[PDB]
Design a protein around this ligand. Structure first.
Ligand SMILES: OC[C@H]1O[C@H](O)[C@H](O)[C@@H](O)[C@@H]1O
Ligand SMILES: C[C@@H]1O[C@@H](O)[C@@H](O)[C@H](O)[C@@H]1O
Ligand SMILES: [Ca+2]
Ligand SMILES: [Ca+2]
Ligand SMILES: [Ca+2]
Ligand SMILES: [Ca+2]
Ligand SMILES: [Ca+2]
Ligand SMILES: [Ca+2]
Ligand SMILES: [Cl-]
Ligand SMILES: [Cl-]
Ligand SMILES: [Cl-]
Ligand SMILES: [Mg+2]
Ligand SMILES: [Mg+2]
Ligand SMILES: [Mg+2]
Ligand code: NA
Ligand SMILES: [Zn+2]
Ligand SMILES: [Zn+2]
Lengths: 142, 254, 192
């Protein structure tokens, strides 16, 4: 920015570029060498991609060049932390957490079931043998 | 089984040995006390249908012990869609004349539900294949039960990774590949009908049946297995059926 | 119709890893699977209309493993589906090192100590996020450009400066053992 009586003051990175917004040439005049200037300008001109607060659900944005990275709270994932892990309890997601059978019920919670010779536990997901020799178990190893 | 290990006695309790006229025919898998799942091609050359025996609790073919139980095979049910001499619909459901007795050495493998098998078991990487088949392609068969761990492949990958062979069979939706293409490990001819068992959250399930392959452990090729998930309803309905007079029954599929 | 996904690309910085692909869906949805060479396939981004999938939580379990992903195409309603495999991806070797930040510069005499802010990554531990040094250790060095060059095995530089003169600085994260993607972008320039 330029406003006559302020321009009498000698060049300063802090005043012209940090405290105010500067142009490539103003910066070039401060740094003098082109490579020192471009090194400055790449990050300075890049902009804060985090300014719009892209990280949802209490996430944290860390700016990068022309991008950002979101750090999510444990219950969320996604580029913008938009994915709620609590809303993923469906049968295609690691069998809905069921030990044996999983059944999707839209509009409500998924349920777990067991193969013949087993019955569902109190936890609603585990299965326990109801017979002496249930299928799929190796007796000499347990 | 090529490149496998001996299954310690009692550790493959669902494995069945099928005999015809007293001779080794094929492998099988016990799914309850009365029913065995095997491969349809195992029955292509059968003349003496009343001479089929299923042996449970077998381990070493050269020695008999008190864990072995033999039962007469009363019925052999095969999809009417199956064509002898070919590969598709390679499954057979056998009814035992009398039930075996469940012991520490004879336990049935769980036949799973179709959806669970398609969306969960299908994505478990490794499963076990077993039998008393050839130890080498065109080699001698095994005296002690052999077992092998094999990784499953989706068909597209199987096709893309397999060396092209003319006139080879199509890998249909009723099949799946598992194994290695480096020539080290694979099931083989005498292992036919045996289980491809999948371990999931502390229980073993039936996912495949030893069916076919280009030789055994051939470079550029995998073992091909019958996709049991396609047959859950077919198998369940037929297990609820009443016995018939003749042994062989060609039942409609689906 | 059901067309297979293409141009599967891994976008990863400080272990935040997103798989991206083509094309935008028309009457089809996607689901992504991820695995290690001998592990089971894990599903993610179930029936999504997105053409991206955050796979961060799966890869940070073991950053030194090599992962392979695949994108399934399903027809709009809910044999084996049409799919495409992604290229392999080993996080520790391929993730971009993030843009560093100079935390401070202190003149302790005729010398200046320049401190680099710990760069946090997506790998977590005690309910905390690990820094790049926590993950990389001796594999990570920081480089300083001042006005010439200095390098450190920690996050601090102790450079000799000429009496009374104002100096400017800029740092870079570097994993010297890499041949490709060995450096991060330059940090913002900070001056005395
Ligand atoms: O609100 C979302 C948008 O916010 C801003 C970011 O720079 C952009 O990348 C993001 O998509
Ligand atoms: C994961 C995120 O990290 C940073 C914090 O400022 C946020 O509140 C959140 O904890
Ligand atoms: Ca100005
Ligand atoms: Ca001013
Ligand atoms: Ca100027
Ligand atoms: Ca100017
Ligand atoms: Ca930026
Ligand atoms: Ca014996
Ligand atoms: Cl009998
Ligand atoms: Cl063969
Ligand atoms: Cl760091
Ligand atoms: Mg100022
Ligand atoms: Mg100016
Ligand atoms: Mg000028
Ligand atoms: Na092979
Ligand atoms: Zn035995
Ligand atoms: Zn006997």
């Amino acid at each position: 920015a330029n406003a006559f009586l302020e321009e009498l003051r000698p060049g300063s990175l802090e005043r012209e570029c940090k405290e105010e917004q500067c142009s490539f040439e103003e910066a070039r005049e401060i740094f003098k060498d082109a490579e020192r200037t471009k090194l400055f300008w790449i990050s300075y001109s890049d902009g804060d991609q985090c300014a719009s607060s892209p990280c949802q659900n209490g996430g944290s944005c860390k700016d990068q060049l022309q991008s950002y990275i979101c750090f999510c709270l444990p219950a969320f994932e996604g580029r913008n932390c938009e994915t709620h892990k609590d809303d993923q309890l469906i049968c295609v997601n690691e069998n809905g957490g069921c030990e044996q059978y999983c059944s999707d019920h839209t509009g409500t919670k998924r349920s777990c079931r067991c193969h013949e010779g087993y019955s569902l536990l109190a936890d609603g997901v585990s299965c326990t043998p109801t017979v002496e020799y249930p299928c799929g178990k190796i007796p000499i190893l347990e | 089984i090529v490149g496998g290990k001996v299954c310690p006695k009692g550790e493959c309790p669902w494995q069945v040995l099928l005999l015809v006229n007293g001779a080794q025919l094929c492998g099988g898998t016990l799914i309850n006390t009365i029913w065995v799942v095997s491969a349809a091609h195992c029955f292509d050359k059968i003349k003496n249908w009343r001479n089929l025996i299923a042996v449970l609790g077998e381990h070493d073919l050269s020695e008999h012990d008190g864990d072995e139980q033999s039962r007469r095979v009363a019925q052999v049910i095969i999809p009417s869609t199956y064509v002898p001499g070919t590969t598709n619909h390679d499954i057979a459901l056998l009814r035992l004349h009398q039930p075996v007795v469940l012991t520490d050495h004879v336990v049935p493998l769980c036949l799973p539900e179709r959806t669970f098998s398609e969306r969960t078991l299908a994505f478990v990487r490794f499963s076990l294949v077993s039998g008393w088949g050839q130890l080498l392609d065109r080699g001698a068969t095994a005296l002690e039960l052999m077992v092998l761990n094999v990784p499953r492949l989706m068909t597209q990958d199987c096709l893309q990774q397999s060396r092209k062979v003319g006139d080879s069979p199509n890998i249909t939706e009723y099949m799946f590949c598992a194994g290695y293409s480096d020539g080290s490990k694979d099931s083989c001819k005498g292992d036919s009908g045996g289980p491809h068992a999948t371990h999931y959250r502390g229980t073993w399930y039936l996912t495949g049946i030893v069916s076919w392959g280009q030789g055994c452990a051939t470079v550029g090729h995998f073992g091909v297995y019958t996709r049991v998930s396609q047959y859950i309803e077919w198998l369940q309905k037929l297990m609820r059926s009443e016995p018939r007079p003749g042994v062989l029954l060609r039942a409609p599929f689906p | 119709a059901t067309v297979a996904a293409y141009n599967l690309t891994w976008k990863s910085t400080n272990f935040k890893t997103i798989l991206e692909w083509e094309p935008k869906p028309v009457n089809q949805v996607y689901t992504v699977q991820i695995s290690t060479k001998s592990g089971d396939w894990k599903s993610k981004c179930f029936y999504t209309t997105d053409t991206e999938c955050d796979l961060t939580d799966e890869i940070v379990k073991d950053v030194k493993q090599t992962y392979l992903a695949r994108v399934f195409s399903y027809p709009a309603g809910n044999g084996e589906p049409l799919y495409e495999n992604s290229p392999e991806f080993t996080p520790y070797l391929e993730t971009n090192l993030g843009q560093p930040t100079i935390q401070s510069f202190e003149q302790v005499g005729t010398k200046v100590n320049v401190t680099v802010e710990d760069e946090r990554t997506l790998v977590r531990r005690n309910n905390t996020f690990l820094s790049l040094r926590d993950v990389f250790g001796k594999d990570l060095i920081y480089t300083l450009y001042y006005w010439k060059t200095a390098k450190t095995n920690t996050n601090e530089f102790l450079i000799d400066v000429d009496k009374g003169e104002n100096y400017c600085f800029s740092v870079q994260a570097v994993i010297p053992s890499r041949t490709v993607n060995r450096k991060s972008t330059d940090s913002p320039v900070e001056c005395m």
